[PDB]
Amino acid sequence: RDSKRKIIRDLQKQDIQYVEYGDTRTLIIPTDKYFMFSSPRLNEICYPGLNNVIRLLNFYPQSTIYVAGFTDNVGSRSHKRKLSQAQAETMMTFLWANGIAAKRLKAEGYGDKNAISDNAIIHGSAQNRRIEIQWF
Amino acid sequence: AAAAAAAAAAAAAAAAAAAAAAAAAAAAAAAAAAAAAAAAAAAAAAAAAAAAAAAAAAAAAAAAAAAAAA
Amino acid sequence: AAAAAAAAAAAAAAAAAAAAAAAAAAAAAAAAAAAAAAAAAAAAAAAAAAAAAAAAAAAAAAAAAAAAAA
Amino acid sequence: LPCRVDGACDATIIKMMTDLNKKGIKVASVGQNYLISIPASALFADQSPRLNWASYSLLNEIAAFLKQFRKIAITVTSYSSKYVSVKRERALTLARSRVVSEYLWSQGVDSRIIFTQGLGSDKPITSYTLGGDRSPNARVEITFRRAV
Amino acid sequence: LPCRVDGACDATIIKMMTDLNKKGIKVASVGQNYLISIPASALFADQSPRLNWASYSLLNEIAAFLKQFRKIAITVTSYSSKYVSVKRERALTLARSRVVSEYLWSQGVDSRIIFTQGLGSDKPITSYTLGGDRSPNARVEITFRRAV
Amino acid sequence: ALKETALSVGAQAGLAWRAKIIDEQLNKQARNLDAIYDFNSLVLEHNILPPVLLEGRNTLNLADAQSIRISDRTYKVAKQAHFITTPPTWRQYLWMDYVKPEAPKEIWCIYTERGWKNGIDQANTILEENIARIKEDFGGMILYRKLLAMNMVSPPYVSHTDLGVTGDGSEIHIDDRVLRITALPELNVNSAEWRAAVAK
Amino acid sequence: IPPSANDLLLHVLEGVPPPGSRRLVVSGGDARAWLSNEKMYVRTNLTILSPGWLASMTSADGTHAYEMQKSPVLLVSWHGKVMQLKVEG
Amino acid sequence: IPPSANDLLLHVLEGVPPPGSRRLVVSGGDARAWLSNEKMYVRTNLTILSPGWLASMTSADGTHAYEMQKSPVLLVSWHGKVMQLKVEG
Amino acid sequence: KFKKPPINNPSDDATIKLAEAAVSVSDSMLEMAKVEKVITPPSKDNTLTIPNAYNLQARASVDWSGPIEELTARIAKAAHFRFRVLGKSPSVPVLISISTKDESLAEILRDIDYQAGKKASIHVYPNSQVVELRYAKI
Amino acid sequence: FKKPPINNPSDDATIKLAEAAVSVSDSMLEMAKVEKVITPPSKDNTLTIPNAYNLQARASVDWSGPIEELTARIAKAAHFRFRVLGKSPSVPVLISISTKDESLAEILRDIDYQAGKKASIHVYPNSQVVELRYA
Non-local CB neighbours of I12 within 8 Å, separated by 6+ positions: B10, B11, F21, F22, F25, J13
Q: In this complex, does chain E touch chain F, defined as having at least 3 beta-carbon pairs under 8 Å apart? A: no
Cβ atoms D7, D70 nearer than 8 A: no
HSE-CB at J112 with a 13 A cutoff on CA atoms is 20
| Dihedrals phi, psi of E141, to nearest 5 degrees | -135, 135
A28: closest CA among A123, A107, A131? A131
How near does any CA of chain C get to the CA of F142, in Å? 24
I115: closest CA among I79, I78, I62? I62
Non-local CB neighbours of J43 within 8 Å, separated by 6+ positions: none
Q: Given an 8 Å threshold on Cβ–Cβ distance, is G79 in contact with D2?
A: no
Non-local CB neighbours of A48 within 8 Å, separated by 6+ positions: A14
Cβ atoms F26, C38 nearer than 8 A: no
Residue A62: Cβ within 10 Å count: 7
Cα gap E78→E60, rounded to integer Å: 19
Chains that touch I (3 or more CB pairs under 8 A): A, B, D, E, F, G, J
Degrees to nearest 5, angle at CA D24 with D18 and D26: 70
Contacts of A74 in chain J (CB under 8 A): 16, 19-20, 23
Cβ atoms I105, I73 nearer than 8 A: no
Check residue D72 and give left, alpha or beta (phi > 0: left; psi -120 to 50: alpha): alpha
Kindly provide the b/e burial profile for residues I100-120, where b requires at least 16 CB atoms within 10 angstroms of the residue's own CB.
Answer: beebbbbbbbbbbbbbbbbbb
Top residue of I16, I18, I23 to mutate, by most chain B CBs within 10 Å, is I16
Distance, first Cα to last Cα, chain B:
39
Q: How far is CA F86 from the centre of its chain?
A: 15
Cβ atoms D117, D94 nearer than 8 A: yes
How near does any CA of chain I get to the CA of E145, in Å? 14
Cα gap F16→F168, rounded to integer Å: 56
Cα gap C57→A65, rounded to integer Å: 66
Contacts of I13 in chain B (CB under 8 A): 11, 13
CA distances in angstroms from I101 to D99, I68, I104, J5, listed in the order given? 12, 18, 10, 13
Q: Given an 8 Å threshold on Cβ–Cβ distance, is A21 in contact with E28?
A: yes
Helix axis angle for F2-28 and F106-149, nearest 10°, is: 40
Q: Is H23 helix (H, G, I), strand (E, B) or coil?
A: strand
| Dihedrals phi, psi of I82, to nearest 5 degrees | -75, 130
Q: Which residues pair with D95 in a beta bridge?
A: none
What is the amino acid identity at position G36? S
Cα gap F35→F28, rounded to integer Å: 13
D68: closest CA among I62, C30, I61, C16? C16
Cα gap C31→I130, rounded to integer Å: 37
Non-local CB neighbours of I100 within 8 Å, separated by 6+ positions: I61, I62, I63, I108, I111
Cα gap G24→C30, rounded to integer Å: 12
If you measure CA to CA, which chain C residue comes closest to D31?
C22
E28: closest CA among E16, E17, E42? E17
Q: Given an 8 Å threshold on Cβ–Cβ distance, is B22 in contact with I11?
A: no
What is the amino acid identity at position F101? P
- E73–chain H Cβ distance below 8 A for any pair: no
Q: Which residues pair with G34 in a beta bridge?
A: G23, G41
- J6–chain A Cβ distance below 8 A for any pair: no
Contacts of I58 in chain D (CB under 8 A): 94, 115-117
Q: Given an 8 Å threshold on Cβ–Cβ distance, is B14 in contact with E29?
A: no
Indicate the residue of F89, F166, F171 with minimum beta-carbon distance to G49: F89
What DSSP line would sit under chain J, residue for residue?
-----TT---BTTHHHHHHHHHHHHHHHHHHHHHH-----GGG--S------TTTT-EEEEEEEEEHHHHHHHHHTTTT-EEEEES---SSPPEEEEEEEEEEHHHHHHHHHHHHTTSEEEEEETTTTEEEEEE-
Non-local CB neighbours of H64 within 8 Å, separated by 6+ positions: H13, H43, H44, H45, H47, H56, H57, H58
Chains that touch C (3 or more CB pairs under 8 A): D, F, G
Q: Is H48 helix (H, G, I), strand (E, B) or coil?
A: strand
If you measure CA to CA, which chain B residue comes closest to I13?
B13
Which residues on chain A place their C-beta less than 8 Å from a C-beta of chain E?
Answer: 17, 19-24, 28, 116-118, 121, 124, 127-128
Determine which helix (DSSP H) or strand (DSSP E) holds A92, and give its type and residue range.
helix A77-97
Sign of the alpha-carbon dihedral angle for A86, A89, A91, A93 = negative
Residue positions counted in chain G = 89
Cα gap D130→I98, rounded to integer Å: 43
If you measure CA to CA, which chain H residue comes closest to F61?
H55
| Dihedrals phi, psi of J62, to nearest 5 degrees | -130, 115
Helix locations, chain F, DSSP H: 2-28, 30-36, 91-94, 106-149
Cβ atoms D10, C2 nearer than 8 A: yes
Q: Given an 8 Å threshold on Cβ–Cβ distance, is C36 in contact with G86?
A: yes
Sign of the alpha-carbon dihedral angle for A92, A96, A97, A100 = positive
Residue J117: Cβ within 10 Å count: 9
Cα gap A17→A9, rounded to integer Å: 10
Which residues on chain E place their C-beta less than 8 Å from a C-beta of chain B?
Answer: 2-6, 8-11, 13-15, 29, 32, 68, 70, 146-148
Non-local CB neighbours of A110 within 8 Å, separated by 6+ positions: A68, A69, A70, A71, A81, A84
Residue C22: Cβ within 10 Å count: 18
Cα gap I82→I55, rounded to integer Å: 13
Distance, first Cα to last Cα, chain G:
33
What is the amino acid identity at position F63? A
How near does any CA of chain H get to the CA of F75, in Å? 9
Sheet bearing J81-85, strands edge to edge: J81-85, J129-134, J119-124
Contacts of A124 in chain B (CB under 8 A): 23
Q: Given an 8 Å threshold on Cβ–Cβ distance, is I2 in contact with E17?
A: yes
Helix axis angle for D55-66 and D10-22, nearest 10°, is: 150
Q: Which residues pair with A35 in a beta bridge?
A: A42
| Dihedrals phi, psi of J118, to nearest 5 degrees | -80, -25
How near does any CA of chain C get to the CA of F157, in Å? 29
- F122–chain G Cβ distance below 8 A for any pair: no
Determine which helix (DSSP H) or strand (DSSP E) holds H35, and give its type and residue range.
strand H31-35
Kindly provide the b/e burial profile for residues I20-32, where b requires at least 16 CB atoms within 10 angstroms of the residue's own CB.
Answer: bbbbbbbbbbbeb
Determine which helix (DSSP H) or strand (DSSP E) holds I74, and give its type and residue range.
helix I68-78
Cβ atoms E30, A17 nearer than 8 A: yes
Cα gap E65→J32, rounded to integer Å: 54
Cα radius of gyration rounded to whole Å, chain E: 15
CA distances in angstroms from J38 to C1, E4, I32, I52, listed in the order given? 54, 61, 22, 17
Chains that touch F (3 or more CB pairs under 8 A): C, G, H, I, J
| Dihedrals phi, psi of G61, to nearest 5 degrees | -100, 20
